[PDB]
Amino acid sequence: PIVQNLQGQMVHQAISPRTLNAWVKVVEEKAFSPEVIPMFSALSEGATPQDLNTMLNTVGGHQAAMQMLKETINEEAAEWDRLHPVHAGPIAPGQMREPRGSDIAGTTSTLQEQIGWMTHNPPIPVGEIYKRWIILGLNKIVRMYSPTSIL
């Protein structure tokens, strides 16, 4: 959960116990269901890496689930590069860079770093991006579980 200071700045307020608690309760009465993917995405409307990470770690802890989520996230990143390219070259001494999705992946970007990308101009939706990624995996997980139930 991120909020905007009174003066004029972007800061996060870490995760919440009531949220994680309820979540845990959900996951419990859910178990990576199609009714938790939406609840998680919403709950992670604009959460940070530590938050989404916390909620992710909070989950049961299935290497299989996490595995797929890992592959998925990696996929999203790839697509990021596929879409918007980037030639890692020179850059002014102090100029920010965009290491493709890999950045939103949290591989080169952290909490503060991500905050900047999201608190920079233009504002990088590193949050919503990651949220979509994580959700992407969860979706893939829920998809795998179900025997392809399409129209």
Fold designation for 1-151: Human Immunodeficiency Virus Type 1 Capsid Protein (1.10.375)
In 3D, which of 114, 113, 150, 112 has the Cα closest to residue 131? 114
Q: Which of helix, strand or coil describes residue 123? A: coil
How many other β-carbons are positioned within 10 Å of the β-carbon of residue 19?
17
Give CA 69 to chain center in angstroms: 11
132: how many CB neighbours lie within 10 A of its CB? 16
With b for 16 or more beta-carbon neighbours within 10 A and e for fewer, the 51-63 pattern comes to bbbbbbeebeeee
Return the closest-CA partner of residue 20 out of 49, 66, 53. Answer: 53
User: What span, in angstroms and rounded, lies between the C-alpha atoms of 141 and 27?
Assistant: 14
Query: Is the separation of the CB atoms in 127 and 53 below 8 Å?
Result: no
8 A C-beta contact, residue 136 and residue 60 = no
Cα(74)–Cα(76) distance, integer angstroms: 6
Q: Which tokens sit at 135? A: 């959700």
Q: Which two tokens stand for residue 30?
A: 């859910």
CA dist., res. 14 & res. 33, Å (int): 26
Q: Distance between CA atoms of 60 and 52, rounded to whole angstroms?
A: 14
